Amino acid sequence: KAKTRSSRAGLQFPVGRVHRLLRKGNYSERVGAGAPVYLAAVLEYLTAEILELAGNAARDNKKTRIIPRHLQLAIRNDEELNKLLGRVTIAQGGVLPNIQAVLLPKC
Amino acid sequence: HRYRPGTVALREIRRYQKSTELLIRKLPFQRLVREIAQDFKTDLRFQSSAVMALQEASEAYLVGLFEDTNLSAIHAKRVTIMPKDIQLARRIRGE
Amino acid sequence: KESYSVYVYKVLKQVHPDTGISSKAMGIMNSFVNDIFERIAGEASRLAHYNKRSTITSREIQTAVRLLLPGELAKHAVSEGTKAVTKYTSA
Amino acid sequence: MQIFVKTLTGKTITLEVEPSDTIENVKAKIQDKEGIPPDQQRLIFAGKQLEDGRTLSDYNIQKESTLHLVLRLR
């Protein structure tokens, strides 16, 4: 009877909330029917990938609670996500451990 | 003994790229923010989260500059970075 | 009020069923979701204004996603976008 | 059988090695893939370090373990 529409699409992001934020965002006059469905699936996928990589980073650093350093290490270590979020600062993010090869004195 | 010069600097790079904390002292940074904003509008107030946002933004900006300046100095066959290198780095960057 | 935090946490339990995130990580993921939401909606809006239409639909969002997301992120996002639209239209 | 190691640049190294080999041989194996000789290759495997006369069979070797070049030329 209730039958939430995000469950009709088989998702976990709020399709009704996405549809509302489309309608009052002044993006267009009308808003199509499948538009918040498509966008909710896309948002859910992007969160799914970044949380999967952050879970791998937290498990590799032996801590079971993802801190924002793990998000920094998840994002800046692959090409597509670092190309997407390339102008994005993360609070308590830190930097990848990069050292230029010339500054390594031999012998 | 005494460490050879450069080894402690490499250890410092290994430390401060592993850490994530704020490398500038918070109270003199706050007083700097308040006296910069003193000139635009007198007698403002600040949310502490806003001053922390300014803290992290300006530190991340300077880290970006120092990485680009390090690239410019390695390009100039040197190891010391120089104000020459800073000025070139941000001129190419667009500033 | 109002966040995506519940939904991010559900996706987190669905992917890594053992871990957790601190509140700063949840805030960063929330800001992430808001940012990509307004990016994709801002691109689909101006696609509709270019083509002189007045309804933002799934085609508009598909081309905006294909513009914004680089590499294989577009090729996957398009795929489950159409999967979710078809599964929604069947019910 | 296929073991990885991060460099000070930040770069991972891919290499396959028999899990009963020595440590001087795998310093030679990484010297094959990088531009760094093992006069300055100091390795760490989970806290306890590496010595060239020792073998992988005693140092907890598995599928896809990790090594780490570090620092400190005395």
Binding site: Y45, A48, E49, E52, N56, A57, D60, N61, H70, L73, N77, D78, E80, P97 | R14, K18 | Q14, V15, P17, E72, L73, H76, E80 | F4, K6, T12, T14, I44, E64, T66, H68, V70, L71, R72
Partner: peptide, 23 residues
């Protein structure tokens, strides 16, 4: 799990380790 035929992750394995490496 469900999200293992739906992502992109193929190559390579990525290291996420950070070691305080003393002497």
């Amino acid at each position: 799990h469900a999200w293992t035929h739906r992502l992109r992750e193929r190559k390579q394995l990525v290291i996420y380790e950070e070691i305080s490496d003393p002497e």
